[PDB]
Write a protein that binds this ligand. Structure first.
Ligand SMILES: Nc1ncnc2c1ncn2[C@@H]1O[C@H](COP(=O)(O)OP(=O)(O)O)[C@@H](O)[C@H]1O
Ligand SMILES: Nc1ncnc2c1ncn2[C@@H]1O[C@H](COP(=O)(O)OP(=O)(O)O)[C@@H](O)[C@H]1O
Ligand SMILES: [Fe+3]
Ligand SMILES: [Fe+3]
Ligand SMILES: [Fe+3]
Ligand SMILES: [Fe+3]
Lengths: 194, 194
């Protein structure tokens, strides 16, 4: 049960998250919960850790900038984090709010949430499951999601590679700064696209 | 004159380069020579240093992989360079071959050639002139070169930003590894796109 990792039941968690997140965002989290379970079944990852990390991954999406900056100071995180924003923070810093609220201490689940946006050069299978589930969950509708879904049915590593390449491409297309850890992920995984 | 910086005349240099480079590549170098002069006039850079660096920037484009690896060892350059290839090497490592052949020791010209492909987080105006001239020289025909040319008529910094964003976008589009110094340039300059 989820109570094996956090301080409340799944139903109680859902009630808490409904107060913290807009409907669309909670619906997304539920989609990621389901997609993470399916991917974990496919690629030999604990379905429960995957489902819980999937549901929680965007728990901190709506924390204010000031709340994130307070968390950076409190936990003495990389001071460069103050140069970025919600995109980087909600996973990389938001894990600490999840930990405070839910008494989540499982290192594997925490890490998978931490890097769900930016990835890392080295990713556990659980990390990869969450990173991909976020991108392919059933509510997502962006052009090319069908390609990501096909790839994810065959290869976890290729799905990470594809998602990361598309993300780097889009950020540059839009003219947005790219958090450097994303490039680390990109260069580590891009070979899987062959 | 070019002899103020190198060990031969411009005409003698052109004869040497014609033996080292395919016609199309030498024609490109001549285009960069001209474009660098025009940009340097516009943005307050020594036209002679710009023209010479422009002509020389792809001097080492055709050196073999083995020659580059020998240069990396000989000059004890960053050992990570061995993980890359001609794209990174011909500027970053090729400067040493230019130095050996032509007795080029001017630090400004050398630096502008060195980073002409990948840029840096901090770039001198000469660096920027070469980086942009390479991209907009009259022989280039790629889709969007007209946009780069318009931007370069108005803002050197915005032209660097535009080129770097398009390059990052294209490399990710193609699924090629991105040398991390390019991201350093990208993040430093992307704000000029506003
Ligand atoms: N390296 C990066 N730098 C800046 N923004 C990024 C980076 N990687 C992803 N993003 C952006 O962060 C946003 C949120 O991404 P993500 O956490 O993966 O999904 P979600 O929207 O479900 O939280 C997206 O707009 C994405 O483009
Ligand atoms: N960070 C990078 N990593 C890998 N390749 C790159 C990077 N930046 C540019 N390139 C590629 O290097 C090649 C040569 O680039 P450049 O030196 O700027 O022009 P030229 O073709 O005139 O030498 C291009 O194909 C370009 O896409
Ligand atoms: Fe997220
Ligand atoms: Fe998400
Ligand atoms: Fe070049
Ligand atoms: Fe060139």
């Amino acid at each position: 049960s989820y109570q094996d990792y956090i301080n409340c039941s799944r139903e109680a968690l859902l009630e808490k998250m409904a107060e913290l997140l807009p409907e669309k965002r909670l619906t997304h989290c539920l989609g990621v919960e389901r997609a993470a379970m399916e991917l974990a079944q496919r690629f030999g990852v604990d379905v429960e850790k995957a489902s819980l990390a999937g549901l929680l991954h965007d728990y901190a999406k709506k924390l204010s900038d000031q709340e994130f900056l307070v968390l950076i100071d409190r936990y003495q995180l990389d001071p460069d984090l103050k140069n970025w924003g919600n995109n980087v923070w909600h996973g990389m810093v938001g894990i600490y709010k999840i930990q405070e609220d839910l008494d989540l201490h499982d290192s594997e689940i925490l890490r998978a949430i931490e890097i769900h946006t930016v990835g890392a050069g080295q990713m556990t299978d659980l990390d990869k499951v969450i990173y991909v589930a976020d991108y392919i969950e059933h509510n997502r509708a962006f052009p090319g999601v069908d390609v990501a879904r096909e790839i994810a049915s065959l290869s976890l590593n290729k799905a990470v590679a594809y998602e990361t390449a598309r993300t780097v491409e889009y950020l540059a297309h839009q003219g947005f700064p790219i958090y450097p850890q994303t490039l680390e992920t990109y260069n580590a995984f891009v070979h899987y696209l062959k």
